[PDB]
Structures are given as C-alpha cells and as structure tokens.
A paper describes a structure:
Two types of intersubunit interactions were observed between the neighboring TTERecR: the N-N dimer (A-B; C-D) and the C-C dimer (A-D; B-C). The TTERecR structure revealed that some residues of helix α1 (Ser4, Leu8, Leu12) in the HhH motif of one subunit had a hydrophobic interaction with some residues of helix α3 (Leu41, Ile45, Ala48, Lys51) in the HhH motif of the other TTERecR subunit. Moreover, Thr3 interacted with Asp63 in the loop of the Zinc finger motif to stabilize the loop. In the full-length TTERecR N-N dimer, the hydrophobic residues Val106, Phe109 and Ile110 of the loop with the HhH domain created a hydrophobic patch for the interaction with TTERecO; however, this hydrophobic patch was destroyed in the TTERecR16-196 mutant, preventing the binding with TTERecO.
At present, the HhH motif is thought to be required for binding DNA, the zinc finger motif plays a structural or DNA-binding role and the [name] Toprim domain is the binding site for both [name] and RecF. In this study, we investigated the structures and biological function of [name] [name] (TTERecR) and its series mutants.
Residue numbers in the entry:
A (entry chain A): 0 to 196
B (entry chain B): 2 to 196
Write the structure that this text describes.
Amino acid sequence: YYSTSVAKLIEELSKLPGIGPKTAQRLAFFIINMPLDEVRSLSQAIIEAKEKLRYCKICFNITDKEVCDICSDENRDHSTICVVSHPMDVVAMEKVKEYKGVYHVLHGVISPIEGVGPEDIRIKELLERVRDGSVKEVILATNPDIEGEATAMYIAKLLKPFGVKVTRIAHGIPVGGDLEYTDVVTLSKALEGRREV
Amino acid sequence: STSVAKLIEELSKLPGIGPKTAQRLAFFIINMPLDEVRSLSQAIIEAKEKLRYCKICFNITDKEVCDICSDENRDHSTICVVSHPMDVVAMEKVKEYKGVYHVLHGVISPIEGVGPEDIRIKELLERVRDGSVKEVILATNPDIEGEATAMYIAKLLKPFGVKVTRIAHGIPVGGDLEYTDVVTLSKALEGRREV
Ligand SMILES: [Zn+2]
Ligand SMILES: [Zn+2]
C-alpha cells in the first residue's frame, strides 16, 4: 500500500481505458520519478488539450481552430464527404493515405437503447451540406455493427431525394483473414458481395 | 528409447506439434491403456482407408457423391472454390449458398512444399470444360497463399467464358474503423458500393 498522494495518482490513472492496476502503479512511480519539469509538461498537456478542444464549424471534427485543417485545405475534394461516427475515425481513415475528400463527423449513431435519435447527432447538418453545397458523393463509413449500419441506412433514405451518389464502405473478409475464423455474418457479406474477375 | 524417439519424430512431423509437444504427447501415449492406444492407432489408418473424395467436388465425405452434389436443388452450374474441407462447413454454416463447391485440398505455397498440381486445379478446369457452368466463385483465404492461387486459377479460367468472382475483401461485420488495419480499410474504401 502507498502514500495517499500516490494512491490518488494510481486511482486517477486506472480510470483510463486499457490501464489496469499494476500498469497504473508502475506509471505512477515512473511519473513521480521524472524531473519536475517533465511532469509539469505531462500535466499541462492534459489540461490544455481539453481546454483547447473545439469542433469544426463545417464538419464537426475535433480541431483547434474554427475550421479544421482538412476543411480549409483547398486542393482537397469538397464534393466528396466521408461520413464517420467519431473524431478518431477521421484519423483512421486519414491514415489510409489515399482519399482526398472531406469529412462529416456525426458524433455518435442512432441508438434507441442509449436513447440517441437522429436529432441527437450531426445528421441534419449533413443534409444541409448536401442541400446547400455541390456534393458528388457521400461515403457512409460508420462502423459495420448494428447501430453503425442502422445509421448509415437511415442517412441513405434521407439523401435519396437529393441526386447525390451515396456509397457504403465494403464489408467483407479482412485482408490476411481466413474462412475458418470468420463469423458467419461476415462470410455472408463476403459471398454476397463477391465481385467479377 | 528408439521406439519413443520415433513416435516423437512422427508426431512433430504434424502441423501444430512442436518438438516439446511431440515429446509430451509421446509419453502420454505410451502411458495410455493399451486398448486406448490401439483405438487411436486404428482411427488413424481407418480414416485413411475409408476416406472418399466426392466424384464431383472432391470433398472428403463418406459418400461416393457427397450430400451437397447429390442434393437436387444445389446448383451445379455455380462452383465455389475453397482450399479445405473445413472451409466447406464454414461456408455451409451460413445457411445461404445455393451452388456447389470445389475443394483444392491446400494452396500453392513454395515455402511449404506444395504446387499447382499438388492440389486439385486441373480437375476444376475439367468441370469448366463443357461450358455448362456459369460462375466459379474463388473463395480461398485472403492471405498470401489464398490470393496467389486465386488470381491464377482466374487466368486459367479466363477462356471457357464462365464468369469468375472473388469473395469480397473489406471490413468485417462487428468490426470498427479504430482497429481495422490500413490495408483492409483501404480496400473497404476503394471497394465501396452504391447503397
Ligand atoms: Zn472540418
Ligand atoms: Zn461433392
């Protein structure tokens, strides 16, 4: 057992996802063993990141400015909007180092259990961007779980009346996977979505 | 003991059995009741002597013509190519495929000791010789092996004019953008379908 001020660190660190007890203890001692200025850096980086967070006025992504870097990039293709559930999906998609389009961040999915409706996530503003803008394609890239799929599907009906091309990211068997260890639901999509040549 | 040493040799020849595991299995085995090791030994050869290969699809079942190829609706004009008998039960568990199969028993891996005549390719072409099949579905694994094998069977199948398709690569159901490898994600993106 540890002094209170250390128990307090350990407890605060253990609240973070993927940080168990032993891992928290370790980190606490490492931290309180770092030079005071290094621990000041950590501590301030934490507080400042939270304080400085803003949501882009165009796509709602996490940013520092009024309009995020991506939206203000002009040789980036504003006629294609990749719709995503969360800020960190934008990073995942952005790391695919193809894709010159822009983004729309919903901040969630439709979810009757969580009690989240379409009016509780950034859907209407997606509509408005498509209504008021010159949009060639909306790529629905929510997750392929039930709610990500319900959400992409809700959005798709909505955008129908506009004459936009709306696509959904390919479900299937992941690269490097094997048929044996693939759930039956994915096999089904892999088969059903098979493609020529 | 030379008899144990040979057991150990025979065991570690097998896939998934490392040197230590062969040895531990070897001792367990020589400790089993005689009638249990007889049974193990018997099961080994009996499965080799009784095994079949379907006359149409080359799957191992205990029928000369397997129950799928025999089934009257099953659609012989569409053939789903997989590597392994376990793959057939995988695909079947989806309670959705209508066509029939072609089991290769393996893939083409230079780095393992297997080539395009160590597996059941020529016999697949023969099925596609008379022009009576529409699509061959290529459903080898989306790994290195699987993919080689498939993009090749596909050249061979090019004549014959049949329609050849490939099991769709992408993000699996239940998966999420955060934990999907870039390669898979890039495929999910560049293969997106109009909803
Ligand atoms: Zn933005
Ligand atoms: Zn058969």
